[PDB]
Amino acid sequence: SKVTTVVATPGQGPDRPQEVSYTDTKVIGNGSFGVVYQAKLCDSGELVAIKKVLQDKRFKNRELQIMRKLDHCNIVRLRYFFYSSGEKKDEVYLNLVLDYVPETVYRVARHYSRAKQTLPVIYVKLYMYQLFRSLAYIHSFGICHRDIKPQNLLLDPDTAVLKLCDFGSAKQLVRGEPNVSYICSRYYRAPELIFGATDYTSSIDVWSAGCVLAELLLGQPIFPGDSGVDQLVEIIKVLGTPTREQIREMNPNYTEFKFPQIKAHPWTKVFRPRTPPEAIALCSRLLEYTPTARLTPLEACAHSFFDELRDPNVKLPNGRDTPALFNFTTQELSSNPPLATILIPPHAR
Amino acid sequence: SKVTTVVATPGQGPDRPQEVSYTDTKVIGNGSFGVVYQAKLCDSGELVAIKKVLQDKRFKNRELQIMRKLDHCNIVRLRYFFYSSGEKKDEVYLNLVLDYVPETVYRVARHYSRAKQTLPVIYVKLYMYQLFRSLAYIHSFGICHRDIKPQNLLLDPDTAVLKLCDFGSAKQLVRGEPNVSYICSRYYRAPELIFGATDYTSSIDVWSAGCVLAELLLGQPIFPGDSGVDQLVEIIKVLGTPTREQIREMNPNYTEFKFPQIKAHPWTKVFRPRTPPEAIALCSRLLEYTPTARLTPLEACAHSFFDELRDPNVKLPNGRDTPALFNFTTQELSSNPPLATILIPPHARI
């Protein structure tokens, strides 16, 4: 029972609207942005999400604009978009029909931490690797996600496919043009953001991804606190006080403020023992005060921490093959093509 | 019962060192900031908190410098302070010996919320009123708390006395001298701070207070969100999109950015019906974009929503007299000395 039928434009096709029918409409997500539905497509029977936001008629919807440009194994796909609403309002809503994926890194991590246990490092490698691809991809367009966190990392429990989602904060950054600093979420904000910088770069996403990796290793977020001050105290307990040369590289307006004069904690006893050394080493190269020093998503994918993934004989724990991982396009590799010699091993060419 | 004796300077007295004896010492809180213990003073039995924090070898601790100036019934008193050791060390620690108060607005709001019930209006008026005095007092030394939130509002659940505590974020603001923008926590941050202003005024505390009142009336936070954007979105749903001039008074760097074009929700529809109209009115004068448009703490105390408190026959639900509400000092009234004629009603003069 109850089939909904709407007139939608495909996400990447040509702008030519078709009838699209779907059932099993249920609310799965609600909040500020608007509402997210689950439904099943009547044709091929496939599961999809429906992000429904209010449309500003002034000019285009940034998120729609970005989703239509993107096509990537590790990013949720925009299948259709369409407009709506017929009950009692008189505003126009945009609805984005997206690929559906049932689990999130946020959930998996919560299951492990609650059960006082650690995610096997193979999953950590798998998930973080695909994240870096997704970022290397979007960054190559100049798009910055600006809200990297465990709730926006989607997972296939059986195939270990991670797909990045929620582009409702994404922005194409232009060098010299101001950006709002108040984006990005509670545990995952780069110090330049905590400092109110309006000229950050994409390296805010690498910082965040470091917070997720560190979290998956620790079983809890590495820099907690309900405020900037509190978060910064955590950051400093681990990184030490930023030098003046680092403060100015984050936000020059902040060089004269009093900071807790705390010395650098050795990165090793941040994590418990038998945490892989390559995992720690990678964290330290992501979570650097000076934005320009953080690794790039592409350089991260090539870090020795992901070597296991490159061994021909790697299998998933459940015995299946690992998901696609070496199918790099030129776009994906544009930032630094000579990396391909590490990124794509002898066996899959 | 292990007794402990230290040498300690009284909080605001003459600067003469004194032997202080305490027992029943126990940890009641951790721990980003440091530690907080509860103890009992020996010769008076009074219970105290002992906030212990790392003390910067290099210059004077700001919190101490602030606490030493304050003497107010709606603010937690610094009784003594002393330096000591703690966990390694090197490192020296400062120990602030403070009035103990067992409950917090944050825990009380929560009790009623869990039990699908609203806090009785009388208690709201009382808690909000006392917070408004605490802020008039501190603001008159030019001191801004910078972290007003339900969990920093201590309550004697029995007598209804509210005391402001946690000065770890407090600073004395000076015009033309910039301030870090990342103070003040989730749910309670004025929009100038979400915009990362460095030249805000004490009126950020008043915004935060607006958020406390609204939260108490709604049974949950008015502006929630795990990010500035979400928060902002919540603010805008209610106040509507800020104008070019409203933005410019919050943070002139932000006046040209794209903001969701949404008109205000009526204040009338934000709160459940039955919410007293004076409460809605008061909020509407606290949660304003233009920081200078907000009520000063002293104006808020004088607002009609507090008239019941100036009733001569008013009593707490449990049948007890109201706590001290009218003992204003020259310091406390110094922003608008006139207003005294509304604030101390006929019965409290004579």
Ligand SMILES: COc1cccc2c(C3=C(c4cn(C)c5cc(I)c(F)cc45)C(=O)NC3=O)coc12
């Ligand atoms: C800001 O909007 C968003 C935030 C985060 C994710 C999403 C989201 C997406 C999905 C969801 C998958 N699960 C398991 C969800 C669970 C919820 I709750 C949800 F809202 C969406 C999804 C999904 O499978 N594909 C999505 O694009 C669409 O808007 C989101």
Ligand SMILES: COc1cccc2c(C3=C(c4cn(C)c5cc(I)c(F)cc45)C(=O)NC3=O)coc12
């Ligand atoms: C960060 O500093 C602070 C944050 C919040 C309050 C406080 C705090 C204080 C008390 C506490 C009363 N309760 C009921 C508490 C409960 C806890 I947990 C606690 F830590 C202190 C107290 C108190 O009774 N007097 C205080 O000065 C001292 O540092 C704090």
